Design a protein around this ligand. Sequence first.
Ligand SMILES: [K+]
Ligand SMILES: [K+]
Lengths: 355, 355, 355, 355
Amino acid sequence: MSVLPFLRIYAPLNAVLAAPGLLAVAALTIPDMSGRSRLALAALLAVIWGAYLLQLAATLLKRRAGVVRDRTPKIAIDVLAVLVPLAAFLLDGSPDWSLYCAVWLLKPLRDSTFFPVLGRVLANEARNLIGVTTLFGVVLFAVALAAYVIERDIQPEKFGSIPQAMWWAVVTLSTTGYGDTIPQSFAGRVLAGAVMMSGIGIFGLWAGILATGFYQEVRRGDFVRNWQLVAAVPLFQKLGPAVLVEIVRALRARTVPAGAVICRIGEPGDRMFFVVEGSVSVATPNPVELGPGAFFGEMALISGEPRSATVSAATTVSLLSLHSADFQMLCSSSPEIAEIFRKTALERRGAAASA
Amino acid sequence: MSVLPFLRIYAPLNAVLAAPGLLAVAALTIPDMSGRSRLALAALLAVIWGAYLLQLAATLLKRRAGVVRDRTPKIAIDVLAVLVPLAAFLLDGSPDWSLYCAVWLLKPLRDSTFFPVLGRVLANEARNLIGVTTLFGVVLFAVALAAYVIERDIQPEKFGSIPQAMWWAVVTLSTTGYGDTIPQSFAGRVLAGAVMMSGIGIFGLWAGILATGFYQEVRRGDFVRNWQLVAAVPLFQKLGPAVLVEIVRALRARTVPAGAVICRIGEPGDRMFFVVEGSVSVATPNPVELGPGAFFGEMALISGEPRSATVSAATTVSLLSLHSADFQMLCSSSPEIAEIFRKTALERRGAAASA
Amino acid sequence: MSVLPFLRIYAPLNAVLAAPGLLAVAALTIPDMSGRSRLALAALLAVIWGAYLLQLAATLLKRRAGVVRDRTPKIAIDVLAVLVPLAAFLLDGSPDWSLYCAVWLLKPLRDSTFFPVLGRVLANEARNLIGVTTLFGVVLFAVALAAYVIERDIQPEKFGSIPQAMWWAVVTLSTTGYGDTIPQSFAGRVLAGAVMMSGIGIFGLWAGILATGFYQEVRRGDFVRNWQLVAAVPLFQKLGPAVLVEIVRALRARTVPAGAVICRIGEPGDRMFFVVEGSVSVATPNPVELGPGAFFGEMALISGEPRSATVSAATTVSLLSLHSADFQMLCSSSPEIAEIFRKTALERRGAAASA
Amino acid sequence: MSVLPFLRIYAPLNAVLAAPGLLAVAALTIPDMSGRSRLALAALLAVIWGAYLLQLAATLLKRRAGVVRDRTPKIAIDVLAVLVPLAAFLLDGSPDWSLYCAVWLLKPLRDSTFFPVLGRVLANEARNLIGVTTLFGVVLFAVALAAYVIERDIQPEKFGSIPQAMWWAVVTLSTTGYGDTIPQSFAGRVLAGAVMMSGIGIFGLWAGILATGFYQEVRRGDFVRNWQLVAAVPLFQKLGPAVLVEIVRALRARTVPAGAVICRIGEPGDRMFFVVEGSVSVATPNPVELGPGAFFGEMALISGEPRSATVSAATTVSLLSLHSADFQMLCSSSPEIAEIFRKTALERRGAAASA
Ligand SMILES: [K+]
Ligand SMILES: [K+]
C-alpha cells in the first residue's frame, strides 16, 4: 500500500548458484544413454565452478573491502560451498561420485532473507512448539498402538506385524494419506478418522506458532526500521513526540535507486513521495530539481487526481509514502499545520508554474 | 456487522462469459457418439460468440462514452478474448481444433475483484515469499537426494533410477500424497515423515504470506474508502479531527440502490442508516421524506427495539451504519453532543407522529 | 481467561435429535442378515419419533408461551423435520424407503450456534470469496486443459480421453490427491506440482476469508454484548465515558446459574467476580450474603493468593471478571479511585471477619 | 525480539521418560528373530524402571519439600505412570503382554507446557467448536448419504453396500484422500469435489478456533506476567500509571541463570538488559559490579553500536529488554526524563572509564 520496494534490474545469484544443482541433477541420472549433458552440463560445471573460484577470490581481496562485520560466518558458508564440492571433484570412485556432486545446493544459503526470520526463530520463544511437539508424540504413539492391536487383529498372513501399524500410522498422521490397505474392521477406521482430525489439528497448532512468528517479525523489524528512519530526517527533529509516533508507525516505503520511472502521471495510484536524500527528477513545464526535506505528491493530493505528476530518481533516494489520513488530521489538529497545508498547496501552486 | 453491500438483482457476466467454457468442454469430448451437443453447444457457441460481437461493438461506440481511463488494457483483455478464439474459429485442422476453443476461459478475467488484491500482490513486498521459495528448493532437493540414495538402495529392477526419486519427491512434498509404492527400508520412511511436516510447514509459511496480504489489503482500501467517505458528507465538516478519526475508522457500510426493502421493522438487527445523498422512503403513519445530512435508526436506538422501523430507497443512496458505542461515547463526551442526543430522540419523537 | 461460561448439567438435544440418524444408519444397511437393529433401532425409531410428536405439541401450546419472535422460521424448520420423515414413514416402496429415512439429519439444524456465524456469512461482504471463486475456475480449467493435452499425449488405449483429464484434475486440485496413475511424461508431472501449490494456495485464500469472518464476528457480538452489559449495571452509571470504554472492552465473562462451586479457595486462578443481579453464597467464618453493585475477588487481590476465597450461586447471577491491570490503573489514575481501592481492601477487611 | 528465554544446559526428562517408549517399541516387535533388544532394551527397561523408582521416592520425601500445592494431581499422574506399567510387569500372559508395556507413553504427560494451553482450552468458550462440530455431522452424513445412493448405483457385485459409502465418505471428508476406487459416474465425482472444499473448509473453521486460542492465551499470560513484573521492581513505583501501562505492555523478556555469555560485544543485536535482582558481570577496563534498579544497554544506545558491550550473570537475574521507541518517547515526553536520558548517557560515560 505505502511501500515501493523497487529494485534495479538485476540477475540474482540464484541463477548462478542454483544452476549447478539444475544441470547436475539433469545429467545426475543415466536414462540409458552414454552422455550428452555429462559433457555439456559438466562443461557448465566447470563454468559454474570457475564462477565459484572468481567469487572466492572476490572474498580474498574482499575479505575486507572495508566491509561490515555483521555476519562473519557467511564467508565460511561460501568457502565450504566451494570446498565440499571440491573433494566432490576429488573422488574417482563409483557413480555415487555423481551423487555427492549436488552438495552445492547449500549455495542459495550463501545469503538470503532467512536471516531475520531465524531472528525470531530463536527469538520466537514459544515453548508451545515443544508442547505441541510432545503432542506429536501423543498422536504418533496413539495411532501407533491402536494400529498395533489392529494390525495384530487379523494375524494370519500380512497383519499382526509391527511394520504395518508403523507405516499406516506415519502416513495417517499426515494430511497426505496415500496407500494400499485399510481396516477391514471398522474400529481401525473410526480411530483413523480420529487421527485425521487430530494430527491435522496439531499441524494447525504448529501453524499458529509460525504465524505469530511472521507477525512479530514484521512488526519488530518494521517499526525499528522506523527508528532508523525517524531520526534520519531533519523535519522529524522539528516535530514533537506524538507526531514522531504517528510517523514512525505510519511511514512505510522503500528506496528506489535511479533508473526507473517512479510514478505515473494521471494514472490511478495511492502513495506518497518524500526526498530523504539526494534529488529526484521531475517533468514539469518549468522543471524542478528536488532536494531533501521537501515532499512530493501534494500534486495528487491538492490537485484532485491520483498521481497528477510523475518523477524519476537520478540518484538513489530513500522514499517514504505518508498516510494522508493522519496528515489531514495534523492539518486539522493545530493552526500551525493548517498553515503547513496552505503553504504546501502554494508550493504546488508555484511549482506547477514558476521556477 | 455494519456493512450492507446490497446489490440489485443482476445476472452477472459469469453466466455468459463462463457458459462458453461450459458447453465447449461439454461437447469438448467424444464419448463415442456422433454429435448432439456439438450441434447444440456449437449453436450456443454462435450465440455466445455473437454476444462477444455485441460486447465488442459496445466497446466500439463505448470506446469512450466519457468513460474513465483507470484500467486501459482491460479493453485489450476483452479484444484478445474475442480474437484468439477467432483464429480458434479459423482452424480446419485436426480435433485439437476443438482443444484450442476453450481459450475464452480468460473471459472471466475481463474484469473481476482481482484488481486490488493484485494491488497488494505487487504492493505485498514480503521477500519472505522469495526466501520461502528458495526453501521450497531446500525441501525439494532434500527429498530429491535422499530419494536418490534410497531409490538406488535396491537397484535390481525398478529402483535405482532417477524417475522414482523424482516423483516420490514431488508428491511427498505436498499435502496430497497419492501413490503406488513406499520405502521397504524404514529410512526412506522416516525421512518421508520429515518431508511431510517440512513441506507442509513451508506451505503454511506461504500461507501467512497471503494472510498478511488479505489484512493489509482490507485495511488500506477500507480506511482510504473512509477517506473518500469522510470528506463526502457535510456534518463531517462541523466535527473536529478526533471525531473524524473515530468515524473514518468506525464507518463501515455500502450503498443500496433503489428497489429493495432496506430493513425489517421489529425484526432483530444491529446496524444504522445514514442518508449520504438523495432521499429514502419510510412507512410511517405520517410518512417522512428523507434527505441528506440526517440519520435514520435512532428509531431502534431510543425506541428500544432492533429495527423498530424500516425504510426503502427510491433513489440510490450511500449508507453508513454508525457504531453506537462511540456514539454513546460522544453523547457522554461533551454537553453539546448530549444536546445532540436529546434533540435526536426528539426528532424521532416528532418523526414518529408529526409531519 | 476472563470468561466463565459455566452451564448447568444438561443432556443436550444432540443425543435425541442425533440418535435417529445413528440408529437409522446402523440398521440402515443389510450386512447379510435378517434383522436385529431393524426391530431394535426401529423401536428406538418410534421412541425418537414420539419424541418428535411431543416436541411438536410442545410447539402447539408453546406456539406462543409469550415467546420471542426473533427467529420465526425455526418452527418451520422443526415441523419439516418431523414431516418429511413422516412421508418417510409413508412409503411402502423398495428398500430406498430405508434410504429416505435419514432426512432427520437436518434435526441438529433445529437450533444451533450457526445463527450469528451466518450473521457475518451474509454480513461478510468479502467479494474476494467471489474473486477467489472464479480463480477456482482458473486453476480448474488450467489443469483441466493441460490434462487434456497430456491425457491425449499417449492415445492408444486408456489416455487421450476427456475423463482422465477430468478426474486427475479434480483430485489434483485438492490437498488430497489419491489415485491409480500419473504422468509417464514429466510435463504432466511438473504442471502437477504447479496445481498443487496453486490449488492449495487458493484453498488458503478462502481460508483467510473465513478467518476474518471469525474475528469480525467475535468482535462485533462481543463488544455489542458489552453494550447490553454496560448499561446493565448501576455503578457503570456513576463512571464516566473513558471508563465506560475501558470496561466495555475489558469485561469478558458469562453467567453461572445456581448449582456449581464457582471458584476454588486457595487454588491458583486468574479471574474476577461481580454480582450483576441476585445474591451469591460465600463460605466465611462470618458468612456474607452477596448483592448487586458489589464485587467479589479482592479476596485474591489484596489477600495475596489466587482465589483466596470461593463462592456459589444460589440464584443465577451474571458474572463479570474485571481486568486488574486497568483496575490498578484506575486506582492510580485519580485519588477518588485510590480511595475506592483502600475502602475495597477495607471491605474485605470487614468481610473477612465482621458481619 | 525483546525476549531472551535462555535456559541452562539441561538434559530434559524427555530422554528418560521417552526412552522407555522408544526401546520398548523397538523390541516391541518380532522381526523374525530370537532376541537382542529384548535382552538389551529390557535391560534399559530395568534401568528406566529404576529411574521411575528413584523418581517416585523423590516424591516420597519430596511429597512436601515445602513445595507448592499448585497442581496436586501431577503426583497421581506420575504414580499411575509408574504403576499401570507395574502390573504391566505383572502379566505372564501372551505376547500382548509386550503390548501393554508402552503404557508409559503417558510419561511425557508428567509435566509439560500443556497446562496453560489447556488453561484456555476450558477458558476458550468458543461454542463455534460445537457448531462446527455438528457441522462435521453435516458434511459427514452428507457424503454418507450421497455415497449411499451412489454405491447403490451399480449394485451387481461390490457396490450397493453400506461399507463403501462409509469409507469413501470418511477419507473423502479429510484432506488426505487415499484409496482404491472412485465414481464411475460423474455425480459421485462432483459431489466428491464438494466434500473436498467443504470438509476442508470446516477443518479451517476449527483451525481459527485454535488460532484465537493461541492469541488469547499468549496475551492473557503475557500481560499478566507483566503484572507480576511491574509491581516487582522499585523504579516502577516512582513512575506514574500511563508509564506503568507502557512498560507492562512493552516489557518482554525472560531470566537468564548464571553460566552464559549474555550478549556479544560489537555484534549486531536489538534488545535491552535490566537488573531485576542480583548482580551481573561486566568486562570493562574498569570492571563494574551491577545491581538492581539500574539498567544496562545504553552502551549500545548512546554509544552507537549494537551491543557495544556484553555481560554475564554470575547470579540468576531476571531480564527485561526495554522498547527503545517508547523510551525515546519518554525522553522527549517531559524534561525530567530528558534529564534521565542525559544522566543515563553520563552513567555510561563514567561507567565506560571510571569506577
Ligand atoms: K492428501
Ligand atoms: K492418497
